[PDB]
Design a protein around this motif. Sequence first.
Motif, PDB file in Angstrom:
ATOM      1  N   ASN A 100     -10.588  18.118 -46.443  1.00  0.00           N
ATOM      2  CA  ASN A 100     -11.447  16.948 -46.428  1.00  0.00           C
ATOM      3  C   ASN A 100     -12.173  16.770 -47.747  1.00  0.00           C
ATOM      4  N   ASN A 101     -13.494  16.758 -47.687  1.00  0.00           N
ATOM      5  CA  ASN A 101     -14.305  16.550 -48.867  1.00  0.00           C
ATOM      6  C   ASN A 101     -14.874  17.847 -49.350  1.00  0.00           C
ATOM      7  N   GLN A 102     -14.568  18.185 -50.585  1.00  0.00           N
ATOM      8  CA  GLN A 102     -15.016  19.433 -51.131  1.00  0.00           C
ATOM      9  C   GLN A 102     -16.105  19.203 -52.125  1.00  0.00           C
ATOM     10  N   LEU A 103     -16.928  20.217 -52.302  1.00  0.00           N
ATOM     11  CA  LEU A 103     -18.107  20.148 -53.128  1.00  0.00           C
ATOM     12  C   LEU A 103     -17.833  20.875 -54.404  1.00  0.00           C
ATOM     13  N   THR A 104     -18.227  20.296 -55.529  1.00  0.00           N
ATOM     14  CA  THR A 104     -17.993  20.887 -56.852  1.00  0.00           C
ATOM     15  C   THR A 104     -19.327  21.022 -57.582  1.00  0.00           C
ATOM     16  N   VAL A 105     -19.864  22.250 -57.704  1.00  0.00           N
ATOM     17  CA  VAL A 105     -21.168  22.480 -58.346  1.00  0.00           C
ATOM     18  C   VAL A 105     -21.054  23.234 -59.674  1.00  0.00           C
ATOM     19  N   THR A 106     -21.048  22.515 -60.774  1.00  0.00           N
ATOM     20  CA  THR A 106     -20.927  23.165 -62.050  1.00  0.00           C
ATOM     21  C   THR A 106     -22.289  23.270 -62.630  1.00  0.00           C
ATOM     22  N   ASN A 107     -22.435  24.069 -63.667  1.00  0.00           N
ATOM     23  CA  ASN A 107     -23.708  24.289 -64.310  1.00  0.00           C
ATOM     24  C   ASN A 107     -23.934  23.219 -65.314  1.00  0.00           C
ATOM     25  N   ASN A 108     -25.164  22.717 -65.363  1.00  0.00           N
ATOM     26  CA  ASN A 108     -25.524  21.660 -66.301  1.00  0.00           C
ATOM     27  C   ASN A 108     -26.974  21.765 -66.758  1.00  0.00           C
ATOM     28  N   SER A 109     -27.234  21.340 -67.990  1.00  0.00           N
ATOM     29  CA  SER A 109     -28.579  21.384 -68.549  1.00  0.00           C
ATOM     30  C   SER A 109     -28.975  20.036 -69.141  1.00  0.00           C
ATOM     31  N   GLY A 110     -29.217  19.061 -68.270  1.00  0.00           N
ATOM     32  CA  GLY A 110     -29.600  17.730 -68.703  1.00  0.00           C
ATOM     33  C   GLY A 110     -30.900  17.267 -68.077  1.00  0.00           C
TER      34      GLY A 110
END
Length: 152
Positions: free
Chosen positions: A1-11
């Motif tokens: 189904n719908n998957q979650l994508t959590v990458t690291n970010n610094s904004g």
Amino acid sequence: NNQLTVTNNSGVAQINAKNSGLYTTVYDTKGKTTNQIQRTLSVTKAATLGDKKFYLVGDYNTGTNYGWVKQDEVIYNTAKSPVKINQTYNVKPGVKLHTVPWGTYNQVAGTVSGKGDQTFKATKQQQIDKATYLYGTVNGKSGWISKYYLTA
């Protein structure tokens, strides 16, 4: 189904006055309202859940996480990791200091005052997209001033 994508970010970002609120979890159906608008907040992570897109926002000077916010409901800017510096600068009176790099009107730390150019002793600097902001002290007041307002 719908998957979650959590990458690291610094904004760093500032939530628009027109927002869906702060989502406690990316899976939540509704965002919880927040008075935390038009303020520079720190971004630590970016998430994609199907068609949804969020940024994890927190307080800059404490690291306290506030919650997830729709990417399209904020003015975002990349933030390079700050660096330690040691340099004294000349700053004219009337120049505003801010509590955070790229701060808003809610984030003023003080104003430079005196006769002629005052002395600003820098300790850290930070790049926000392409602008460099320097943290230091002018007459007891500590804060962030953009390099545009400083002269060597």
